[PDB]
């Protein structure tokens, strides 16, 4: 049952991202329960992302060494148990929660690095490509379901610990289902990797695309981590009051916007390719620029009303998510086949490091600094978070400029890549 195995793999990816973003779903409850400032709230996700980073290449190497299904199932069980423990950590110990988040990041990196290898090993046809596509679509749905499930469980059970308690049972069930259905598939060096690296750094468009993807990761992390709290605080500032509904709406919009952005980016790049060879990078920039504007407008709109802010979420999320499907094409066309795997690994590492790894903690630090320098009140908390988020669209614009430079150098570095292949 290879098709059923890949179906369970997609479900496991959905649950992986669900568990990843559950904490962001119940961000406010965690912060109020532990009495921790915004800095720790961002530090949770920062530690998670750093663990994901330091785990992805090691888990890839391990998969290259040992079987993939065993590692993946062990990981599912591992992070399921870690989250279940996270739901029981004492209130007085917050470092325990941070450590549990780090371990969950390790496990989820193991899954994210092992699953595509399993999918590729199972089949090597259009059906296998479709399985890879369904596994990829599990990501935005996973995040949206994470925010929705966290908010719904926290509101229904009257305790945010239940939002974390629900997921591990599904994790264990999905791990057993994976271990049973997935069939086992079978399919110096450091110096060679260093040569490949040096070659990559010699490339201009690859470096520019890596920096722009890092900016995209920064924006995505910071926003996905701080926007539900921002919506709750905006509602608090306004006379109208419900912050669980806002997180639910944000999750639904995030899922729908991920789908819409992927499809529209694919269509737009398809059209623009016929006009000019540099279309694939250019498109990205354009989108992000638009997104940047909207990503800023929301904040102002967030002070006026929440519905306009949600429309801004829709448009900006679509524009920002349009970039992922095209970044892979840019990387594939820029780098030669031999150095493509190393290029992908290095790009992922750089995108998580320069961006996502330090974005949430930076937003929290800026918000806390603005709060401390000023009078303390819910409105000033809202304003501090708004400024910290407003920092992001500037990074999005910088990433758009990086994509523009990638567009400029795409033809010349594509010409350099093909000449090397021929020789």
């Amino acid at each position, epitope marked *: 049952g290879r098709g059923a195995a890949a179906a369970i793999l997609s479900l496991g990816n959905v649950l992986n991202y669900l568990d990843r973003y559950t904490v962001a779903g119940v961000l406010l409850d965690i912060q109020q329960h532990f009495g921790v400032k915004d800095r720790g709230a961002g530090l949770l996700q920062s530690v998670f992302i750093c663990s994901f980073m330091v785990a992805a290449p090691i888990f890839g190497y391990l998969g290259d060494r040992f079987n993939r299904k065993v590692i993946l199932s062990c990981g599912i069980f591992f992070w399921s148990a870690v989250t279940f423990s996270s739901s029981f950590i004492p209130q007085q110990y917050f470092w325990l929660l941070v450590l549990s988040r780090g371990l969950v990041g390790i496990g989820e990196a193991s899954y994210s690095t092992i699953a595509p290898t399993i999918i590729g090993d199972l089949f090597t046809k259009n059906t296998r490509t479709l399985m890879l596509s369904v596994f990829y679509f599990a990501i935005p749905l996973g995040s949206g379901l994470g925010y929705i499930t966290g908010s719904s469980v926290k509101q229904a059970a009257g305790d945010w610990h239940w939002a974390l308690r629900v997921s591990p049972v599904l994790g264990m069930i999905t791990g057993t289902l994976i271990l049973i259905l997935v069939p086992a598939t079978k399919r110096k060096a450091r110096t060679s990797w260093l040569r490949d690296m040096k070659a990559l750094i010699r490339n201009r468009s690859y470096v520019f695309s890596s920096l722009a993807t890092s900016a995209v990761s920064f924006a995505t992390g910071a926003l996905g981590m701080w926007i539900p709290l921002y919506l709750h605080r905006a509602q608090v500032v306004q006379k109208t009051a419900e912050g669980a509904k806002d997180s639910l709406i944000f999750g639904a919009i995030t899922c729908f916007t991920g789908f819409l952005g992927v499809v529209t980016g694919a269509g737009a790049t398809r059209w623009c*390719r*016929l*006009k*000019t*060879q540099r279309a694939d990078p250019l498109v990205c920039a354009v989108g992000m620029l638009g997104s940047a504007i909207f990503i800023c407008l929301i904040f102002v709109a967030a002070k006026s009303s929440i519905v306009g802010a949600y429309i801004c979420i829709f448009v900006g999320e679509t524009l920002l998510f349009s970039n992922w499907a095209i970044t892979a094409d840019i990387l594939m066309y820029v780098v*030669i*086949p031999t150095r493509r795997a190393t290029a992908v690994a290095l790009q992922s590492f750089t995108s998580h490091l320069l961006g996502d790894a330090g974005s949430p903690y930076l937003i929290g630090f800026i918000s806390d600094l603005i709060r401390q320098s000023t009078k303390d009140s819910p409105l000033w908390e809202f304003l501090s978070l708004g400024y910290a988020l407003m920092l992001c669209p500037f990074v999005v614009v910088l990433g758009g400029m990086f994509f523009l430079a990638t567009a400029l150098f795409f*033809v010349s570095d*594509r*010409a*350099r*890549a*093909e*000449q090397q*292949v*021929n*020789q």
Partner: nanobody
Amino acid sequence: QVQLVENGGGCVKAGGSLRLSCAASGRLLSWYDMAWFRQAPGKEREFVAAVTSTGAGTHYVDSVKGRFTISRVNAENTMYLQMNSLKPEDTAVYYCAAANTRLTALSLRTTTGSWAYWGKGTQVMVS
């Protein structure tokens, strides 16, 4: 979705110069790798030359190396093969082939089966 039109092929004396031009207008030519394949009257089509979609890398078969030069202009969406020091063995129908851009070595792509596009071709003769 590309149409290939070959022109410039005719009778030329031994040792003369002749240019064969392949034009494409269905889709932007920068997205396709191109090649010239010559078919003899009693033999199957053989590899003459190939050029990448960008025009940086060019490949020629051993028999033709040093006499024919392949150069493509993406601005005119065309590919010109200049042939010099023509010999009687060069007599054949030269067909133009275009293929979807892939990072596969041209020397490996001499099976005349990877090119998904083809044209009627322009005949050439020597003395």
